[PDB]
Every structure is written in structure tokens, then in C-alpha cells.
Amino acid sequence: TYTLVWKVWILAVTLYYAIRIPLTLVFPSLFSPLLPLDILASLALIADIPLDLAFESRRTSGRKPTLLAPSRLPDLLAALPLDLLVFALHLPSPLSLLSLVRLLKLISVQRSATRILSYRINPALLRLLSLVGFILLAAHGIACGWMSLQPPSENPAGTRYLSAFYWTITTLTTIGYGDITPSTPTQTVYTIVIELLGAAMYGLVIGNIASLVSKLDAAKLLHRERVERVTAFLSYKRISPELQRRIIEYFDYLWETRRGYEEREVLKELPHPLRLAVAMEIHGDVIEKVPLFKGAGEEFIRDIILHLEPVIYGPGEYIIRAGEMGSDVYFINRGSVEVLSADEKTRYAILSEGQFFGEMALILRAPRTATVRARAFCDLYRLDKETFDRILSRYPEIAAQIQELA
Amino acid sequence: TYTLVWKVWILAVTLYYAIRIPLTLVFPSLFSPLLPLDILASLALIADIPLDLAFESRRTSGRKPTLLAPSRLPDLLAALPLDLLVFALHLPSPLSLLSLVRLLKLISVQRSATRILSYRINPALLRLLSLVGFILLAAHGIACGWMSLQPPSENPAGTRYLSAFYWTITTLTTIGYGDITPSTPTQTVYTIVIELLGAAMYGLVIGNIASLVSKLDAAKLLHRERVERVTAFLSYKRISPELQRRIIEYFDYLWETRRGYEEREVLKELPHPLRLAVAMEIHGDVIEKVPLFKGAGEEFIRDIILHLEPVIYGPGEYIIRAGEMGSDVYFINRGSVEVLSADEKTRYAILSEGQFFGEMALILRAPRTATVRARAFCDLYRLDKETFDRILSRYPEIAAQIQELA
Amino acid sequence: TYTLVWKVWILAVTLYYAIRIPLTLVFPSLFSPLLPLDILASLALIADIPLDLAFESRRTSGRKPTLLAPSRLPDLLAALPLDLLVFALHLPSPLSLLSLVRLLKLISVQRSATRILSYRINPALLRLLSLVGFILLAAHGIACGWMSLQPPSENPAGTRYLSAFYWTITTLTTIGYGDITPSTPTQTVYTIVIELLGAAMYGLVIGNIASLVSKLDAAKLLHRERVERVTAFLSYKRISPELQRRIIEYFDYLWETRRGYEEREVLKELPHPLRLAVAMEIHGDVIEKVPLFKGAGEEFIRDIILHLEPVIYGPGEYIIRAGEMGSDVYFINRGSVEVLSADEKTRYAILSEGQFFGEMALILRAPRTATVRARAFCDLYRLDKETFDRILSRYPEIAAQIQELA
Amino acid sequence: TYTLVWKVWILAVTLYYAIRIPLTLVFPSLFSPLLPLDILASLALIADIPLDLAFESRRTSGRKPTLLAPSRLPDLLAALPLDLLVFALHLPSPLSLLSLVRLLKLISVQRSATRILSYRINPALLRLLSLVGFILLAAHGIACGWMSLQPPSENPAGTRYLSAFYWTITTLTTIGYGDITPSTPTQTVYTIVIELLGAAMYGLVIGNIASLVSKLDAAKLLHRERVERVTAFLSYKRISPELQRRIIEYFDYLWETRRGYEEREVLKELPHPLRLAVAMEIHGDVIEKVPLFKGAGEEFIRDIILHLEPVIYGPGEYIIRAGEMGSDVYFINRGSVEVLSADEKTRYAILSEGQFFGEMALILRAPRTATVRARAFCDLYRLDKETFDRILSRYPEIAAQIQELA
């Protein structure tokens, strides 16, 4: 949308004001040669007042003020051509400061950037970058103020501005070389207030950096503290080192795969329709592929899919042991698994991605026919007999169908 | 209440003490011309001791001490007219410091402001502002102490105080120009202790700023990390980009509407009566408007309303598909929805705010008569058949009424 | 226990070492006059090695090393009388530094203080205070090192130590006056390493302060953000201002009473026996006072009490409305409540702390006889009919007793 | 694996580049005598480009780019021998800076260390250490840049490098002695940009330190705030000091044993197979030791074990009181317990680690035969009658067996 390039243009005009206004306050001779752009800067800026008023009124509706409220005032009062008149008639120093009203546009530009950005940019990083930009603009303004109090001299404007910017950076960053310092009480008061301002600005920078880096690896720290808690509890319970190693490597696999997030908790953030869509896409072509499920309507399938629960079986450990009272069908979703004889002397089968096993427990209460043992991290899904019956009761005809299949 | 203006007056008197006491310690000639206000300052301050004792005793009751406990002592010992006597009889320097006992009122004024404010003011911002005020008062006191150690000279009191405040600000902010520095061992020791104090104060400022800005966008970061977790889990599960886009825009709608808060968790903070009131106001004139509900007493309505659960259906996705085994009535609460034929070739109806659909599943087990599909984000509420029966069992007469309606 | 005074004595001896060793390294003449205390310091310190080994071995058992492991080594190698020999034979500078091995006792004293304290002292505040103490000791040591590199001069030892401490404080606090600076390459290298160390130490101070103050009002911020979330969700749902005000004042009452903690979640931290004890003490002499409960054994009472759930009814709102299907007994626990006629034209009763109402719903399904309305914040407890029956089924004889009472 | 020593070698070569390139930029005479190692440095570095491409392609598969993407570019463009050619033909200053392209290897070495480490090293501490290393390398580079702008002089290269490093450390650490400062506009601009960079670097150091120490005792603070909440809620409920003391010591035991972690929540992080393994190892040889359990298959045992719930009975408080309606078997797991007569006048038994009691309630509804009272913190497990029946229903034959045992 072309509103973005307009916002960028308004940002450039605001930066032009922030640079020029204090720079031409100390250098009146700089006013007239840049007068065309100022007109270009002014006609644009006032034009932004109603135009942007449209772009914000047409979202979320509810009418918008144009002469009221704490909001929309910093733009309104910054629209006035106070700078043009005050420079044109050469108003004296203590009243020429009214030219700074253009700088009030900054606190509206920051709000605009808070929604032009902050989709693709971290909000803490966005706040830090806005603070850095404001600090640089303030450093320019403070250098101009420092120049305004220096005794007049024949030094080139460039070198005196460089000295003023050197001093203001030295102060704002609290480095404080002190090679150039106030020589007069007014410079002393200005330096005191600038020292307070610089301490506040550097504290803001440090606080924003800490806020950023304190959450820079939130997932990693959340997983690590979870592992630490689990390991400490196991060590208290005097669990053998081998089982702790198996748990450690399970957590390592879980982190390397899905960054430590619990599978069941992630599919709890989503609403029911989105959970249904996600589950139907995860379990696509693996649930209608079941023989005892085939032929049932998709309202049965969608009810079945929402109740499958994830379970990460580790490598080499048992999922099913023959002769037990098996009561849970399974569906493989990332790993592979081996079906072995009751004595594990021979391998019946190898199953992989999109395959399933344990169907018999759905149709019959018979004990398990064979052992099932994970080769890799199986990363599969489970469905209990009792839940299957509960969700089957609402579909009597397919219950009779599966009873006939038995 | 007039107690607020009294507290503000006591704050002003305490600031007057904090300004004058160290300033007149180095300038004895300043004592006598301000003596009237000191009397005004003193008669007020002692008067605050019992008076405020009332205002705190009449809340939470339980009696209050007046010569005991760590609390209420900083006010008591600060009530004493030590400053008046010590200035009146010109006690020498090492014992004149007892005039500072007025400054103990600050740690009671801060406690008072912690409850006069902190309703309408962020507690972290309140602590930061109190720290800044205390730092400025301490800067004044430290400038006075620095003046007290300077060799006597004919410089105007104003310019020497300005130099002392310049030095103390330069030190407390760790900028350290070093253009003015200790010339004598006593000034060196004072500068060492003031350097430690200033480092501690600036560390406190930075820590408070970090604590503030680390929670300045808690809701935004909590929503963003939730979105990141969901997206990472989806990407691990190899979900298609279009479904991820639909989930992303659902989360965007949820944030723009209710700032990322889960609807069910917010109505869990409230107690049962407040949950009932909030639910009755959300679902007002949308639940008695139901035909199969009309005529039932309000104890049935209030039982029904507490069990409605929220579900945000996304735009263009199905809520009801014809021919299924529908078992859930619905109530629209923000969006709009279209009722379409079983082949979606023609639109039966458009429903909006305060409308409902799916009534049939309450009265009959018949399959759905038509499809229902969200136009916008529907943002609606659902009620299951089984929950409806469970809460209906306690009202047999209206169960018979609805059975007759069928 | 006398072990505390022994630990305090060992702390004092360690501080004596930390002060004297670098101070006498630059001042050899200070060694001999303090030799007695050094013997006193040494005979004690070695004596601490086995003695404390007992005090830690007799807790948690499991045997302890005495010549092994990363732990217990800093104490062992600090026990050696390296300082006494190195000062007695006047070993030259580059090898005299071995006297510093006494300072290794600090990292054991800190560990000891981490368990002598940290019961009654905040762990973050304890870490900050230990850091401050270590920083002051390091400042003394660094001042001694700075003196060691200064060209020899006839200045008094006191004033040169004061200048060195001034410089080291100026550097460690990053203030950096620069009135005294390296004059030689070795002093330059020492200043570089001390600048790195001071930057690290001041960063540690700031980080510890931020960690402390970022959790200084955890309860207040946790309650405030909960209130903000609730209010934002209500405002999205367009709830009337009066209901929002009632919710705001409910949250204010909850904070002022129990600091924002959910009553049900606090009695979830405790184990079953402690939950039972706490509940029996909360509901003492209010549950046997019930007429339809009197005479039952205390195994019935203790089963009843664990199932009472808390509910804070706000002032002026209804708890019971006459003619409804009441199914929940109530017990008042902080507030008061008024029993009013079905038309609220006359007050039947006022009930307060330790009183109860709604008994009839336990014995009979009859509709409520009268309205019950909170005067204050009632802050009471509730018991459902269905839960009462479920916990009654295990006591058939008292069920028959209450059936006879009906 | 030998890949680790190769990564360490590549790290050493990258550090060699970071040290030499800016050092030989200001000292051309240093180029030729180190030319052999440069060849050794270069032939290795290019060799790393495909070789490491293998080591990362053989994990997680999916093919890898070699001329594309933001990743793998900093290594590619750093492989080029720009330094060798630019030094060999003595390209002038403003274009000789292209030799710095070797330094782009740093942002790949950091990524490599992020996975060579971060298993055994805290990620926040790892980030802090990487930042410190980068800051030291940048300090060397900035010292070289400062030397590049100094007017030429006959001072030894060592002492001028020492002065430059002194200045850059003084600036980056914000200490700012100001004994050496820019004398020319170009040095002023360089100092301004270096002041900004140093402020940013020191803010990064402080932020990383705060992020580290704000989570340095997460478990301790999480337990302490839980204790504070519990104690505040108890004090609001006016619970007696003795019960609060018992709760305080229960929490102290819980912290000293398992660091404040809830037993039930830790065995919720693990998946079902790992939960089963951990439970089977915790309850090994204590569940088959039961007489009414012996003889049942291990599918019954494994179903029983998953349902045992932990409960920490405090010292001296009752677990079982005679004559009640006992309905829960128990298993001791850390502590000891005393079985006492119904009048507690005589002790029937003392049971300890691995023992059990309360078996009768499983087989019969008879009231408890004797009292059971904890000596120490019992730290045991419980199993309800109703849960036992629910998990028994799936094994009818052993239900008949236990019915015969009765």
C-alpha cells in the first residue's frame, strides 16, 4: 500500500526538521538557502494532519477527534509553521525556541512506526532502535545547544559543531573525558541538566538491552530449567544413571525436534476449528488408511482424530509386549518401529512414517499378538480403547459395522 | 478527602527541610531570615505525628503504637525540633549534623506516597520516580557537604553551590569530568564515599529502569512467544503454509481484539458471582430470545449461561456441515455467519450479532439441516448436547416442556 | 549453637587476612608488630579445616573428602602458613605474591554464609551484599597493588594509601576523574587490567541490583497485570462501567486482604495432611456447630471440610434468591450477610463470622425459603449438594440419620 | 570426534587473523616475517569451507547451499585471500581495509561454538563469554585504528600500542580518564564512533550479566515466593503460629530434599514410557513384595505403579487413626513410621524404607485396625480404594484371586 511510502516520506521530513531546526537556530545564515525544502517540508507536514486522520479513522472506526484528546495533539501543534515565521522575522533567542514545536512530530512518528513495524520486528528491539534514533537526534540538538552557549569565535562552523557533538557524546555516554568542560555558570547549568539527561538516556539504553537479552533465548532457558528440575528430582529419587541418560537424550531429541514445546500444550492454544484443521492435516491419509475405520463418514474420522494423543517412545524401548492386555491403537508419525515375536527371536515387520499398529485391541479384548519395540524415537500417537468406545457410542451404525468385522 | 492535601503539604514541608537544612548548615546567615517558615514547618510537622496516627489507625484497626516498633519511629524522631535548637545556639560542626534528623521524614513520606499513589501509578514507575526524587535531594545534600569541605573563599554563594552541584552530579552519574577534584585528604575520603554512593544510586536507577522496561510490553511478548511456539511446532509437523497463514491471521485477530488473552482463562480469575454477572451481561437478550428456552425461569437461564464456551471460528471455514450428527447449539457474539444449502449453491440466511443457530440439535438427534460457514471471524459461543442434558436434568418440568415442543 | 560464633570468628580472621596481607606486602615494616595476631590468625585458620569438616559431615552424611574434590580445596590450600614463611624470610616481590593464598578462604566463607544466612535474608540481597564486600576487599587489594607500582617517595603511608584507594574507587566505579593516572607502562598495564576488572565488578553490581528490584514487588505486579488483563477483556466484551467498577473493587478487596493470591491455589501447594490441618483450623467450631452435622464422627467432618470451596461474594449482591432450586450450603468466614424476605421488604436475620446458612438444600430438594444478600464482602465457603452426596455415600449410617432428620 | 580439534584449530586461526590483520595494517613491516603462518592460516581457512559444509550437511540432511543464503556467506567471503594480495601489493590505506574480510569468520565461529558448547555450558554464560571475547578482539582492532590516526613518531611500537589499548579500554569501559584524547578532527570523529560503540558494548555486557544473575537462583526464588504466598495466605486466615511453623519446616524439608519441586509435576514432564520406567525404578521391590499383589502379572503391577500418588507426611502427625474408614494403602519411600495401638499407649511396629501398610483397606471395608503416625518426614506414596478398584476391573482374574484371599 502506498501509505507506507508516505509514512517513510513523513519520517524523512521529520528527521529533516530534527536536524535543521537546532542547526539553523545556532546558524541563522543556514535558514534562507534551505528555504525551498522548508516550504516543501511544511506543505507536506500540514497535509499529513488530515490525510493520516483518514488512514486511522478507516480502521476500527468509532470516529476520531481532530482538535481534542492527548493523542493527535502532538501532530496538530507540530503542523503549525512556527519555525518559518520565527526564522523569517528573526525573533530573539529566548523566544526563538518555539521553532522546536516541529520536534513534537517525533512522538507521533514513533507511534506510527510502532504499527508500521512490530509485525516483522521484535517489539523490544523496535523500542531499543527507536530509543537509539531519538538519542542521536537529541545528541544533535544538545550539541546545538552547547554551541549556542559557547563564546563567539572565528572557528569554522564544522569544527565547532564537531567539538560540540564530541562533548555531547562524551557526556551522554558517561565516558566523561573532561577535556572540554563548562567555563561559565550558564554552561555549568546546561551541563548539569545534560548530565542528568544523558544518565537517564544511558540507563534507558542499558535497561532496553537487558530487557532484550533477558528474553533472547526464552525457549532454550525454559527447556534447560525443565531438564534441570527433572534431573534433580530423579537424583533425589536415586534413579540409576542409565535411566537418567535415557531421559537426558529424550529431552535432547525433544529440543532438537520441536524446541522443547509440549505437543499437547501447543495444540491447546488453537481454537477448536484450527485444532481440527491441524489434526486433520497431521493425520491425513493415515486415518482413512485404517481397515476397521474405512467406510465410516468423515464426522467419525474428525471425532477420532481430535482424541489421538502424542507419545514419544524412546529408541529401543517397548511399546507393546506380547501377551499383555493391550487396549490402545497406535499411529506412527515421525519414527520407525519393529514388530517382533513374543520371544524377540525374529522380526515380524518394520513399520515407518504413516503406518499404524495395535488395531486388534479396538475390535477385540484378546491379548497382544506380538511385541512392538521402537527402533528410533518413534514420536507416535495413541488411542485408548475406552476413549474409542466413548466416541464410538455416538455412531451406532459404524459400531455395528466394526462388530460385524470382528 | 482533605487528607490528600494535608499529605501534599507535609510532603512540601519535608522537601523544604531537605533543601534548607544542608543549605543553611553551610550558610548560617540563611537561618534567621527563614526562621518564620521554620516555625511554620515545625508546628506542622509535630502536628502530623498524632494526626496521621489517626488516619492509619482508623483503617484495618488493630491499634497502633506511638513510641514503639521500627515503623512510626522515623516520623517520631524526625518530629523533634533538633534543627531549631542546634541552629539557635550555633553548635559546632561535628555535632551540628544532628539537624539532619528532619531528613528521616523522607522514609515515612515515601511510605505514605506508596499508598496515596500506586493506585493510578505503576508501582515500578512509582519506585523509579521516588528514587529519582531522593537522588536529587541527596545530590543537593552532597553538594552542601562538598561546599563544607572546600577552603573558604570570597566566591559568591550561588556560584560555589553551582560548582558543588556540578561536581556531585558529575560524580553520581559516573560521568567524571575531573575538572574539579579533591585537593585535601578529607575531600578525598568524602569523594570516595560519595563515589560509592553515586555508583550505588546509578546502579539503582539502571536496575529500576530495566525492571520497568522488562515488563513494559508483557502482553505483547507473551502473545508473540505463544505465536512463535505454535509456529515452530506446526513447522516441525510439516503443516502446509496456507494453514499456518490461517493460524497466523487468527492469532493476529485475537491480539487486535483482546490482546492475546484466552477467553476461558479471563473468566476464571473472577469468582462465581462475578462470573455469573459478566456472563449474564455478555449473553443478555440473546439467551431468552431462544424459542426453546423462552418461558423457563431465570435459574435455568443462569445455569445455561455459565456453561457456554467461547470459540473463534475463522473467516470462511465451516462451523456446521449438513448431514452430520450435530450436537451443539451456537450463539453469535461479535461476527457474522452465513447459512448455506447442503451443496453451498444457495445461501439460506445471514446471521449477525446476537443471533443464534443450531437449536435443532438440542431438541432432536436429527442430522444437521444445512451448512453454516463463517463470513468474518465469527467469535461465537457453543453449547454441547451432553452438557445441555446434564444441566437440564435438574429442571425436569422444562425438560418435559421442550420434549413437548419437539 | 556455638558454631555460629565460630563462623563469625573465622569470618573476622579472613577479613583480617584480606586487609593485612596486601597492606603488609607493600609495607614490610607492618609485618613484625602484628606477628602475634598472625599466629592467632594462623592457629585458628588451620584449626577450622578439620573442625568445620565435622560440622558439614554430620549433616546429610555420606562421608566427606579432606584432600580431594573442587570443594574443600580452597580451605585446605588457604590453611597453609605461606604468608608467615614468605614474610619471615623476605622473599622478593614476584614470589612474595604467594602470601595471597590466604585470600582463597573468601570463596569458602561466602559458601558458609550462603547457609548461615539465606534463611532470614533474601538470596538476591545476600548475593549483592557478598558482592559488595568482595568489591571493597578487592578495592583494598587493588589500592595496595597500585601503591606497589608507584615510584618510591617520602609521602606518609596514610596519604599514599588514601590516594591509591581514591584511584581504585574512581576506576572500579567507572567515574574516572583522571587526576591521577599511569605514568609508566607497568602502571598502564595494571590500570588496563584493573579497568577491565572494575567494569566487570560494576556490571555485576548493576546486574544484581536489577535482579533484586525486578522481583521486589512480584506480588503487586502479578496482581496488577491480572487486573489489567481482566479489565481489557471486559472492555472488549463491552461490559458496563458499573460491573467493571464492581470487579475493580473486588480485586482491590482481594489484594488488600490476601495480596492477590487465589484461595484455592494456595491450598494446593500444601500436602494432604497439611491441607487437612489448615482446613480444620480455618473451619474449626463452624462445622460441628451445624445441626444436621452434629453427632457424626470426625472422619465425616474431615471429609466434609476438605471439599468446602471458597467464594468471595461482593457487597450488596445476591448469594441466594428465594424460590430458586438451591443446592449449596454456605459458611461465613470473614464477612457478614443479611437474610431477607422473598420481596426484600423485611430482614429476617443478620449473620456474621462463623455462622452458616442454606442447610435445607442438604436435607431436602425444596426451593429456597428466603433471599440471602451480602452486606460486606462475604468471603465465605460453599458446599454443593452433589459433592455432599458423593462424600456422604461412604457414611451410610449418617446418611440414614440425616434422612430421619428430614 | 576429531571434528572438535579441527574446530579448535579453526578458532585459533581466526583469532590469529583478528590479532594480526589490524596489527599489521598499522605495521607493514610485520607482514613479511609472519608470511609462512599466513599461508598456513590461509590454506587451512579455505579448506574449512567445504569440509565443515560436510559436517553440517550430514546432520539433519536436507541439502545445504554453498553460494547462497544469509548463512554460509560470512565463511565464504572470509575464505578469500584478500589480505594476502592487499598486503603483497601494498594497496593504500582507504582500500587496504578490505583485509578485514577475514574478521567475518568470527560470526561463523560464534555460531559453531554455539553448538560445540551450550551442552555443558549455560547459554547465557556462553553468550556473555562470547561477547567478552569479541569485545577484547574489538578493543585490539580499535587500538590499531587509534594508532593509525596518531601523528607519526619515533616511539617504540610496543609503547604506542600500549597507549592505544589503554585509550580504547578507557573508552569502551566508559571510565574516561581523558589523559589522552583526540587532537585532530579525524581523531575526534573516530573517538565519537568508538564512544558510541563502547557504550553499546558496555550496555551489552551489563545486560548479559543482568540476564545471567536474574536467573542464577531460579529454583530458590521460585520456592521462596511460594513460601511467602503460602505464609501470607495463612496469616490472613489467622492460622495459629504452630501450624505455620509446621508448614514452614515442611517447606524447608521439601527444599532441602528436592529443591522445591512438586513431585507430581516433575513426573508430568516425562512421556508415558519414561514415566513408567521411572515409577518402576522408584517402586522396585516394594510392589511385588506386597502379599495381596504377589502372583499377579506385571501388566497389573505396571498399571498399579503409575497411579501411586506422593504425599509427604510431616513428623509426628497422623497418617492413619484407628477406627476410621480407611480406604488407602501406603508405601514408604524415604522416611519411617510407627504403628501404634488405638490408644497410642504401645507401639505395634516400626516401618522404614521400602515397607508398606494399610493393605487391609484394599481387601476389606473394615475400619482401621491401628493408628499409624510419622516419626520423621515419611515421604511416602498412597493408593486409594476407588482407584484400585478402577484399575482392578480390567484384571478380573486377579480380582477374584484377591476376593478369595479375603
Ligand SMILES: Nc1ncnc2c1ncn2[C@@H]1O[C@@H]2COP(=O)(O)O[C@H]2[C@H]1O
Ligand atoms: N432459512 C433459514 N433461516 C435461518 N436460519 C436457517 C434457515 N435454514 C436453516 N437455518 C439454520 O441453519 C442451521 C443448520 O442446521 P441445524 O439443524 O444446525 O439448524 C439450522 C438452522 O438454525
Ligand SMILES: Nc1ncnc2c1ncn2[C@@H]1O[C@@H]2COP(=O)(O)O[C@H]2[C@H]1O
Ligand atoms: N429467621 C431466620 N433466621 C436466620 N436464618 C434464617 C431465617 N429464616 C431463614 N433463614 C436462612 O435463610 C436461608 C435461605 O433459605 P435456605 O433454604 O437456603 O435456608 C434459609 C435459612 O438458613
